[PDB]
Design a binder for these strands. Structure first.
Ligand SMILES: [Zn+2]
Ligand SMILES: [Zn+2]
Ligand SMILES: [Zn+2]
Length: 88
DNA sequence: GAGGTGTGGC
DNA sequence: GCCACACCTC
């Protein structure tokens, strides 16, 4: 009646709290990657949606994160964070 | 730079 | 489910 979301694969008894995390984990067993990049010529596929959204910034040149000292811009927040270490 | 992924807010 | 942070790995 009330229980955690479990992976019913024989060799996997792992569990998750969010249903979305289990659905993503199942794709590691089947190898499915339903999130396709429609950019003509790319062909990349991903198991989750967020790496595709992130990947897409490569094509669009979207770089919201900018260093306010040297003016260099990045497409990801983790890239800016690492860059800031250069200004310590 | 970039993908892969654990985790969480909405 | 979507999106994003943060960390890992190459
Ligand atoms: Zn599993
Ligand atoms: Zn692409
Ligand atoms: Zn800078």
């Amino acid at each position: 009646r009330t229980a955690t979301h479990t992976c019913d694969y024989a060799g996997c008894g792992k569990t998750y709290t969010k249903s979305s995390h289990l659905k993503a984990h199942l794709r590691t067993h089947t190898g499915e990657k339903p999130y396709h990049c429609d950019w003509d010529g790319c062909g990349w596929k991903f198991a989750r949606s967020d790496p595709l959204t992130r990947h897409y910034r490569k094509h669009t040149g979207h770089r919201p994160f900018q260093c306010q000292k040297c003016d260099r811009a990045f497409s990801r927040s983790d890239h800016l964070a690492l860059h800031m270490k250069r200004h310590f």
